Amino acid sequence: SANQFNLSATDNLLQQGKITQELINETQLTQSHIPTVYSTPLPGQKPSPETFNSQFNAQPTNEDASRSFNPNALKRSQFDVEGALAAIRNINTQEGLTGYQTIKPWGEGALSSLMYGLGYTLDAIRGRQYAFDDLAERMRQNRNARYNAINKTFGREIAKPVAVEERWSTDLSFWAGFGLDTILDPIDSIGVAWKASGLLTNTGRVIVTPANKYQVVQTPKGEVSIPVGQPTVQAKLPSIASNNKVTSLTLRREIRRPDGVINWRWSRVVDGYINPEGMQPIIEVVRRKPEVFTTNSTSGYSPNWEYWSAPKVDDLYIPAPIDVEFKVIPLALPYGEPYPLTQWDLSLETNPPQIGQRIDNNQRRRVIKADGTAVYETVRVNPETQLLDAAITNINVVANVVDVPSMSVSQSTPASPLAIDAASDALRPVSPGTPLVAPTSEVNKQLVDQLTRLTETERMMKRRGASPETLERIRTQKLELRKAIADGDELAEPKVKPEPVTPAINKTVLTGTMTMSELSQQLLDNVPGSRIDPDKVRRVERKLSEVEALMKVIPNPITGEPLLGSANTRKFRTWAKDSSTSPTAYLNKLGLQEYPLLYRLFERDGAAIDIDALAHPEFRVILDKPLPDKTSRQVVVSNTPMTINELRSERKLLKSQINELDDPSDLIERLMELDDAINNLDITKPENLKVVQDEVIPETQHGTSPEVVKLTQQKLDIENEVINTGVRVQELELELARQKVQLEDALSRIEETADINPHDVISEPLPSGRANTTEGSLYHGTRVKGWTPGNGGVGEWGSGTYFSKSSQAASDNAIKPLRPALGEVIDNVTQPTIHEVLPDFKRTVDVNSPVDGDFSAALLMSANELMDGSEFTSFKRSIMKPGTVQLRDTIKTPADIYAAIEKYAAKNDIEWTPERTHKFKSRINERLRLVGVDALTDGDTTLVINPDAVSVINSHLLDETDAIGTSIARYNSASEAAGRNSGIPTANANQAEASVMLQRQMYEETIEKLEDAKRQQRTAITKSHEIDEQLTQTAQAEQTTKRQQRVAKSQKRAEREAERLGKKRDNPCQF
């Protein structure tokens, strides 16, 4: 189009540049368009009426210091006692007042303005006129006992936290409340009324649901190796013994031979039979609805069993589906216990075998300071984060899961969601020895990916003309995978499986998300090689019913019963720690103060809870998200399903029964149901209304008409709303203050490190050259549209294209944002893409190996070419021995050579910039490529210098996330880079910068949340004020009417009495 910018005719023509200089008026266009130039044309004094009247406004000032960071802050905010003394003394030198005992005059609003107005606090002064249960110390003692070498054993002693008088207001010890019940009453008015009436050692293992890893080795071919401890349990199926068992070696389980083969979506499939006793046999479901169980045929459903019976040649790992007995040839069940149950730890990281690969079943860092010395810094974790992780992250979180490899679906199996998924081939076990399962579509996609990978491997082998044995084995593997896609033929069309009917729940719901302040506190102590889980930071505002359902699922660790009864509907209306109708208050009442995990799991801001998924008898817990290497690891979990005076009398009596022996417990459930009954009483009753009106409601708002009672109910409800919103705002403000303090601390700490990070360096793309064993597959994550291995990059080692052995690192590199310097150069950007390559290397130099002669020759040639004679001599004196050409004894690896180069560059900070250092490393890399070195790699990260050495295979797309996920990915990439290259100060500087950036982004997110919460608070407060005003008006009208009626009655009685004694006095003795 001719108006692509949607400008006016003259403006569009000017933008195109089609208007000549002669027709242009310089003054008008200078004043209109913007390539233009710019041009610039007595402390006791009585406060002024403006200053005094500004003290009552809701928004008197719009000062915003929330984004003004001062790393060297000298915060000493103290109440000016000397200024107050000066003002008082000045005031007393005026005209003395008369007619009062106190003779000195009055400062008209000056003292209140000075002591309370704006431009070691006053509360300390007021507190000079007048124990706590330290939960953190007790938890630390318990965890130290658990960590002791005698107890069990990986002992890491937690440091001692600061005193409770100086501890942070959001720390671990204050999750159960501040412990101020003795000083202040609960914030709810109804709670105050009930209080006045009187009605109100292996802890490291937590049970959450009601009652290993394999390494890969480049082989002569692909290896699925395995840490060898023996099988705590062999996954057997004793259901049918003797024959019809194969016991395939790869799967480490027994499969069935084809001789013994004699508006919820789940509710839709079963057609409404969702009760736990009225489920119908699975066979009926298959017969009635075959269009969801058959391959779009009339009557020929047939679960193939020949394939899984035959042992997999070349030990190909294709997870067989859950076995099924009934075969289709063309009733209220108790539902218990049709599946075997086992214990699974949710916090353990799972590394299952690679699908399609062979199985053999049987800290210190160097930092360059500002002055220019590269001293080491032992890395350590501050006591606060240590205690937090010991209380939440380091504990054992267990769940009751269905043992899939030992489970079988029979004829009399109830129509459970797991039963439907197993019969429909939706979930397949993946790890041989654990109940981990994955959707079948994931396994099919992994098989397809392996098929493509080894097909291109076969093409490369054909091009190289390798030995016929390798070609034949690759052909056999290809045929095996192609058969396994369809499972029953070589010519059959590939099959697509349906979505499993079992709902999925993210494991963070059962694990707990870390708040942004705690995450930044962890970030304050950068530990190389660590990773931040993006799902542990993603929090969403919950609802009361969702938390109620979650506690209905989670059982009480003390007794094993569910935390909340199945019939307890709407037991919570408040989120406050200090209230009485909140999850924190309920957990404190139950006495579960030693379980901070329970407190974290039931907070207002946590992971998303889907009520339907928890309502189902069986639901999936997702343990790790899908990756191009590994399927989404999931587990399957099975769910096992009066007046005020009277209540006071029983509550007093119930506690009295404690003094005797009675029964073992005899008290918990009765007291709980009694307290729930007290909680859910009605207000409209005259007795409760009288008690509340005489306890909390002022006399000006007393009444009995329906309007007054309704307004009282509305007042209590809006008070609850105010409680919730104020608590949310307070928590967000505390988190914001903590994040600001920690970000200022991080900035102050990073200001001590020299600026050597090459974040504005653009490496030239790598030019192309002339150009039997099978290697693995390298991964590269990028956001650049039209990426080729010759693009290269800028890193610690130098120019070249970086590839990662682990798909996790490449995925993290794929979501990290394009560098701001590189953003101005890259023309087009796209979705986060992960590119496959198979390495084809002739010679490879290890970075953690002794330096060979060729590397030294390249180093010397590069230094001679780039640096001057004096600089070259200084470098030689710095790194080389005084009398020989051989390297110094302290320098032995190319990584150490890079560290020495960085140290030399930082020594001459004046004339050496990160660009020049990276150019020197790049020149070293080009000289190495000239020698004939393809790439530099430690095990995991390969720096390809010659783009012709790799071939692109496939591109995997990732979902574009928000800004905070992008920052988390960038920090993860920087941390992994630092973890590999611990000795290079550039990696540590990059990690520190990434940490600060992530903290800043989290601070911005907290600001947004705080603004939302403040708006909600304003709405709630205004509504509460309106309700209180209306209630006062109505009650006053009622009281005035009643008083006027009584006055009229009294006046009429006076009239009658006066006329009665107004006739005569004729009664002898009656007055």
Binding site: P49, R126, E165, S169, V722, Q1051, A1058, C1069, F1071
Partner: protein
């Protein structure tokens, strides 16, 4: 009195004090609940401190801020109601400055820090009170011209005090946006209300500035204390500590290593707060003075103490001793519950008094006046006077009275126009009666209308009846003694004596009749009479001289008291039955007791009547002479209470002869240089006979329950300022009663607007025994306890009412229709027209609204049947008179013939007038077909006179003229 029982004989009056002060331990004041709600809402939206220790400090500071706001708002609410309550409050805190244990701010004592802290807290209390007083002065100055109701003014005062604490709450709670929003909403509502009330911006700014200055006192004091390292000298120099209180505390710290009559007299003498006054309350409550002060400083604790460990009798005694007028009230709840305790006859007046006392006093006066208007006496005075004969028509005075004309005076006065209808004023203005008669009637109207006099009478009767009831023998004639008490009260106020000094005399005789002349004062001047000052002992001795176990009982049996007792007995036995058996004639009892029944004179009834009359006469004698400084003002006020500008027609009497003659004039007996016995028996004593039967409504109600009517003075003990201004107020000059050591307090009235703007209030405990000088209180358990005030009255009443009889005192020598009432209301060229032998008079008088005597009869509130009976009786009387004059001459005197002829001709002319009027009324009756008695009221319902009626006949008029001419023919002859 056997025409009764032991039941309904003691139930006639009530005397037991009921308990109406209620305060459970779980009750909270309105200010406390409001502040708790507001601070809870503020706490829900606070800004939590970022460090836990700072959070704990903030929580403590917030609780303290709530406590201080409660204190400030309560004090401001108290000061807004009664400004003087500041002086009683601060002076007590100044008394307890330094050693107050129980201060709400604070949750061998050698630590200087704790002593300094207590001292600083008390100084903060005093400075807060001073600030609230300054804010009150500023508020009054601003609100003087706007002119809104007192309830709205107090509501605005409380709201301003609450809103002034906005900066303090904003800073204490952390300047959180929610806290500022809540306080801004409250401030905006207050601004809207204030601007609606008429305040401008500058006045609102000044009021808010003063309130915010008030609220910042406590933190200012704490900053001062902490900044100087607790330097008491510098704090005193800054002017924060009162100098006198600090000096007293210093003296107390360095020092640290008695009849009730004196302390009570000292407490009464000073209007300001006196610490020894607390000692008085120490004796009544069995409680130490320090403990009483501590309870007083804490309102809820004071209410609990009052409602739990103190009985109703103790509260009544304390209030009637004037203690409650000086003990400070620390919360509005104290004032409201004390108002609830003193129950007026109607609770709605107490309800009005709780909010606005001035309107309550006005409503009480209005109720009394309204009950006066429809009373049994104000409607039938004219009817009963002209029937019993004790009222003489104006035309009859011309010829009836040779000398007694000087002893006759009209009934109507200037202020009577504001009680009765103007048409009834015409009828009342045509009546002339005896001077004592008119004064007694005016006094009966005065006592039953004024709140002050009614309260004084109620207090006196309460004391008398509550000391009569505890005597088993004397309790059997409560109604008789009350009736005599009321009659003597009316007589005494008719004489012009000081009503409010009646209790004093009631003690004095009670002393003398028990002790002798020694129980009086001979050393200081008492009253100026004659030409020199005569002491009280000499005055009483000369009183006894000129008048006519227990020593002086025989002094009651003298010549003068026997006749008075006979007169009282005659009145009682005429208006009701005998005091013995009920069914007994009026004259038979006195005749039997006089002409016979030797040694049986001076019955208990006669003894009690003589006692009462002696006490009233003593009161009149002390009140009618020129007294000393203290009693002169009270006497002058009592004289100025009279309705007419002149009942004071010089009753200040200076010599004994005139005063004795005046007293004998107003005390009848028989014989005496006094007009005649017959005139006394025909025109004066029948009035007292009728008055005994026609007591007003309010007097009967007060005599039925006297506590409810002394409740007026008990209420005014709490709030006694005027609405107009505070310029004229000198109640301290009246309280300096040096004449007697009796516990009677005379105060002035300021709530009434008119005309009782200077009324007198009597405070007299109902448990005071004058003979033994003790207070007989009833403990909470139920055991009577005697308290010294420096065989009591019950013994005297038992000995007055025993079977002992006196033997022939002094003399005992021997016994001493409707038509005329209808005629009595009848009222130049007229005399010359009708002088003698004229007939045209009818044609010159038949028409005329003034001549409509039936209108006057209707205005008299006379029943139609009574009017018909009177007309028939007049006809019969004229028929008899015609023959008895024409043909039955007892004395054929020309002058008597002419006089009786004129009288009967006028009666016949009135007969014709009312014949025409009643025929007209019957015509209207048959025209409207209505029941008769209803029509009698209906006549004043339509406010129609007979003038507009024109029901002419043509036969009725002819026959009426014919019969009238036939009547007058032989009369003229």
């Amino acid at each position: 009195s056997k025409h009764c029982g032991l039941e309904a004989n003691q139930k006639a009056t009530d005397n037991e004090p009921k308990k109406r002060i209620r305060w459970n331990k779980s009750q909270r004041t309105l200010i406390e609940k409001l502040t708790a709600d507001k601070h809870r809402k503020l706490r829900q939206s606070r800004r939590t401190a970022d460090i836990y220790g700072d959070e704990v400090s903030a929580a403590q500071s917030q609780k303290l801020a709530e406590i201080e706001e409660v204190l400030i708002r309560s004090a401001g609410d108290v000061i807004s109601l009664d400004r003087g309550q500041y002086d009683k409050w601060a002076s007590l805190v100044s008394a307890k400055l330094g050693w107050r244990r129980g201060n709400p701010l604070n949750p061998a004592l050698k630590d200087a820090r704790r002593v300094a802290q207590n001292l600083i807290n008390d100084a903060s209390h005093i400075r807060m009170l001073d600030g609230i007083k300054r804010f009150d002065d500023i508020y009054r100055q601003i609100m003087k011209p706007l002119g809104m109701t007192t309830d709205d003014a107090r509501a605005l005062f409380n709201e301003t005090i609450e809103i002034g604490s906005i900066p303090k709450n904003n800073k204490i709670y952390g300047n959180s946006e929610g806290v500022r929003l809540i306080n801004s909403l409250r401030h905006s509502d207050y601004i809207e209300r204030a601007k609606g009330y008429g305040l401008n911006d500058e006045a609102i700014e000044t009021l808010l500035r003063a309130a915010t200055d008030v609220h910042s006192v406590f933190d200012e004091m704490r900053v001062i204390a902490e900044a100087t390292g607790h330097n008491i000298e510098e704090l005193q120099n800054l002017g924060y500590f009162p100098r006198i209180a600090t000096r007293d505390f210093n003296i107390r710290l360095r020092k640290a290593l008695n009849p009730l009559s004196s302390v009570w007299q000292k407490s009464r003498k000073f209007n300001y707060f006196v610490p020894d006054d607390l000692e008085v309350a120490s004796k009544l409550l069995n409680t130490s003075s320090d403990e009483i002060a501590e309870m007083l400083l804490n309102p809820r604790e004071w209410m609990e103490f009052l409602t739990s460990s103190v009985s109703s009798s103790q509260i009544e005694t304390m209030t009637e001793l004037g203690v409650m007028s000086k003990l400070p009230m620390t919360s509005r709840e104290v004032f409201e519950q004390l108002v609830d305790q003193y129950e007026l006859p109607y609770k709605h007046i107490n309800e009005m008094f709780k909010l606005d006392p001035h309107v309550a006093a006005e409503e009480y006066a209005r109720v009394l006046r309204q009950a006066v208007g429809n009373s049994a006496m104000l409607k039938t005075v004219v009817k009963d006077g002209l029937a019993a004969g004790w009222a003489v028509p104006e035309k009859m005075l011309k010829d009836l009275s040779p000398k007694e004309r000087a002893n006759f005076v009209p009934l109507s006065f200037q202020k009577l126009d504001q009680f009765m209808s103007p048409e009834q004023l015409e009828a009342a203005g045509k009546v002339y009666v005896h001077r004592v008669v008119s004064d007694q009637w005016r006094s009966m109207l005065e006592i039953s209308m004024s709140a002050n006099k009614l309260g004084a009478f109620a207090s006196a009767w309460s004391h008398l009846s509550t000391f009569l009831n505890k005597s088993v023998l004397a309790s059997r004639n409560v109604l008789y003694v009350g009736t005599n008490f009321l009659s003597g009260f009316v007589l005494t106020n008719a004489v012009g004596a000081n009503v409010f000094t009646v209790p004093h005399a009631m003690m004095d005789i009670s002393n003398y009749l028990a002790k002798g002349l020694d129980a009086f004062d001979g050393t200081k001047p008492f009253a100026k009479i004659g030409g020199e000052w005569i002491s009280k002992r000499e005055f009483f001795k000369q009183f006894l001289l000129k008048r006519g176990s227990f020593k002086s009982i025989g002094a009651l049996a003298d010549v003068r008291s026997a006749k008075r007792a006979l007169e009282y007995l005659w009145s009682y036995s005429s208006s009701f039955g005998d005091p013995v058996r009920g069914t007994k004639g009026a004259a038979e009892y006195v005749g039997s007791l006089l002409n016979e029944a030797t040694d049986n004179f001076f019955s208990p009834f006669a003894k009690m009547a003589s006692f009462l009359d002696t006490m009233y006469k003593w009161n009149a004698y002390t009140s009618l002479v020129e007294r000393q400084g203290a009693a002169e003002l009270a006497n002058t006020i009592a004289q100025g209470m009279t309705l007419e500008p002149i009942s004071r027609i010089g009753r200040k009497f200076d010599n004994w002869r005139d005063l004795s003659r005046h007293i004998d004039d107003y005390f009848f007996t028989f014989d005496d240089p006094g007009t005649t016995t017959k005139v006394i028996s025909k025109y004066v004593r029948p009035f007292a006979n009728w008055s005994m039967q026609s007591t007003p409504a309010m007097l009967r109600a007060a005599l039925r329950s006297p506590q409810k009517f002394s409740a007026y003075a008990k209420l005014l003990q709490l709030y006694n300022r005027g609405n107009n201004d505070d310029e004229p107020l000198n109640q301290s000059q009246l309280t300096d009663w040096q004449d007697d050591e009796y516990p009677v307090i005379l105060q002035r009235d300021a709530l009434q607007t008119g005309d009782g703007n200077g009324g007198l209030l009597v405070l007299f405990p109902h448990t005071f025994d004058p003979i033994t000088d003790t207070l007989n209180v009833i403990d909470n358990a139920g055991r009577t306890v005697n308290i010294l005030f420096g065989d009591g009255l019950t013994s005297m009443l038992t000995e007055l009412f025993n079977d002992t009889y006196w033997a022939k005192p002094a003399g005992l020598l021997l016994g001493i229709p409707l038509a005329e009432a209808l005629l009595g209301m009848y009222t130049l060229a007229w005399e010359t027209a009708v002088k003698n032998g004229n007939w045209s008079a009818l044609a010159l008088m038949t028409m005329g609204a003034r001549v409509r005597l039936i209108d006057t009869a209707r205005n008299t509130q006379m029943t139609l049947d009574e009017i018909k009976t009177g007309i028939d009786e007049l006809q019969k009387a004229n028929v008899n008179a015609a023959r008895q004059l024409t043909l039955n001459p007892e004395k054929l005197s020309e002058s008597e013939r002419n006089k009786r002829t004129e009288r009967l001709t006028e009666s016949l002319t009135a007969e014709y007038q009312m014949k025409y009027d009643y025929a007209r009324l019957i015509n209207y009756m048959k025209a409207k077909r209505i029941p008769p008695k209803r029509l009698l009221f209906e006549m004043q319902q339509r406010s129609v006179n007979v003038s507009d009626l024109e029901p002419v006949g043509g036969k009725q008029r002819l026959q009426l003229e014919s019969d009238f001419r036939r009547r007058i023919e032989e009369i003229n002859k």
